[PDB]
Amino acid sequence: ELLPPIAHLYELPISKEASGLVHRTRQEISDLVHGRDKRLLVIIGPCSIHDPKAALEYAERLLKLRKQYENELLIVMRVYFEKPRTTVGWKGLINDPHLDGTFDINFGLRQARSLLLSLNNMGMPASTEFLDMITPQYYADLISWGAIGARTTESQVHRELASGLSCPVGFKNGTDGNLKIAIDAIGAASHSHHFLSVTKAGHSAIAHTGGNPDCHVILRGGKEPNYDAEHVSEAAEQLRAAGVTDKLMIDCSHANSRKDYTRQMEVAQDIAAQLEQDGGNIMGVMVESHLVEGRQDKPEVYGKSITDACIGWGATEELLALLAGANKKRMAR
C-alpha cells in the first residue's frame, strides 16, 4: 500500500532555506550549461547511497570544499537512490532500503526525502539519477541536477520525464559509446510532451510538460574512454551540428576509468590539462567518491560503496584542488 507523495511532503515540507538553495543552484547550473559562467560543475560523491548517516558525514566534509572553491567550482553532491543493474541486483535505497530483499519502498522513499532535505538544509545541493517514472514526485523538489543514465538516454519515457523536470539534466552517452543518442535526447527533452504520469496524490493523469531548456550531454566512456580533448572537440562539433549546447560534462568514472577507481584521478588530470590549454567546451565533471575507497559486497565497513568502487576522502581532496587550480586559470582568460 503505497503512500502518495503528499504524505511525505506533509511530514517533510521543503524549507525556505532548501527551496532557496535548490532554486539558485539550478539557475547557477543553467548558466554553466549555456556558457554564461565558466565555473566547473562538479557532481561528486558515492556511486549509491546505502547509509544516510555516512552520507551526512560525507556531505559535511564536502561542504567545506564547496565553500572554499566556490569561485572556480560549483560542487553538488551525488545522492543516487536508484541504480540500473546490468541484469539483476540491488536497485538502491528507495527500492530496498533495509538492504535485505524486503523492498520496503515506503520507508525508502521517506528516508530518501529526509536525507535530501537535511542535505539542502545544511547548504549542500544534491543530484540523482532519475530512473523510475513514479518516484520523482517524492523528492524532485530537493534536486538541483539530474542524470539520465547510459542505459536509458535513448528511452522516450526518460526523455519525457526529463522534459518535465525543473532542474538541469545531463544525458549520458550509451554503454558502447554512442553520443548521438544523448544529442537526440537533448532535442527531445527540450520540447513539450504529453504523456501519462502520476500526481502528488498518487493518481495517474495526463502530464503536459513545457520542455527543459537546460539539458546537456555527459561523456562516460564506451568500448573505449571518451574524455580526451580529441573526443571533446568531436562531441562539440556534433552538438553544434544539432543546434544544441556544445557545453558538456565529463564523467571520470564508469567506462572512462574502466571500473578502476584509481584512474578517476588520471582522467581528472587530463581534464585539468584541457582546461589549462583551452577546454572551452567543458562545463562540468562527475566523480565517484566516498569516505573510504574501494567497494564491498556487503555493507560491513562504514562509508564504503556496495556498488561501484569509489575514491576515498583523501584522493577526493586532491582531485578537487587539482580541478579548482586548473579552472582558475581557465577563468582568468
Residue from 25, 175, 264, 281 touching a copy of itself (CB under 8 A): that is 175
Nearest to 55 by CA among 308, 304, 250, 280: 304
Instruction: Confirm or reject binding of residue 99 to a copy of itself (CB under 8 A).
Output: no
Q: Which is nearer to Cl ion, 92 or 279 (CB)?
A: 92
The least CB distance from residue 162 to a copy of itself, in Å, is 13
Instruction: Confirm or reject binding of residue 148 to Cl ion (CB under 5 A).
Output: no
> Per-residue x/- marks for Cl ion, 41-70, CB under 5 A?
-------xx---------------------
Residue from 96, 214, 228, 288 touching a copy of itself (CB under 8 A): that is 96
Residue from 67, 191, 258, 259 touching a copy of itself (CB under 8 A): that is 191
The count of residues interacting with Mn ion (CB under 5 A) is: 2
Per partner kind, with CB cut-offs from 5 to 8 A, the member of Mn ion, a copy of itself, Cl ion, none near residue 313 is none
Instruction: Give dist(CA 185, CA 117) in Å, integer.
Output: 29
Instruction: Give dist(CA 321, CA 90) in Å, integer.
Output: 34
Per partner kind, with CB cut-offs from 5 to 8 A, the member of a copy of itself, Mn ion, Cl ion, none near residue 308 is Mn ion
Q: Which stretch binds Mn ion (CB under 5 A): 32-40, 118-126, 264-272, 305-313?
A: 305-313
Sign of the C-alpha dihedral, residues 181, 22, 32, 263? Answer: negative
Instruction: Confirm or reject binding of residue 136 to a copy of itself (CB under 8 A).
Output: no
β-bridge mates for residue 146, sequence order: 128, 169
Per partner kind, with CB cut-offs from 5 to 8 A, the member of Mn ion, a copy of itself, Cl ion, none near residue 300 is none
Q: Which residue has the cell 537533448?
A: 186
On whether the CB atoms of residues 176 and 154 are closer than 8 A, the answer is no
Per partner kind, with CB cut-offs from 5 to 8 A, the member of Cl ion, Mn ion, a copy of itself, none near residue 203 is a copy of itself
Nearest to 65 by CA among 53, 56, 74: 74
Binding residues for a copy of itself restricted to 51-70, rule: CB under 8 A: none
Q: Which stretch binds a copy of itself (CB under 8 A): 12-20, 60-68, 183-191, 275-283?
A: 183-191
- For 137, the grid coordinates are 514526485
On whether the CB atoms of residues 129 and 25 are closer than 8 A, the answer is no
CA 231, 234, 238: angle at the middle one, nearest 5? 135
Spatial neighbors of 307 by CB under 8 A, at least 6 apart, are 47, 48, 83, 90, 295
* Largest pairwise CA distance in the chain: 57
- For 304, the grid coordinates are 564504503
Query: DSSP letter at 256?
Result: G
Residue from 12, 40, 47, 62 touching Mn ion (CB under 5 A): that is 47
Q: Which is nearer to Mn ion, 150 or 215 (CB)?
A: 150
Instruction: Confirm or reject binding of residue 86 to a copy of itself (CB under 8 A).
Output: yes
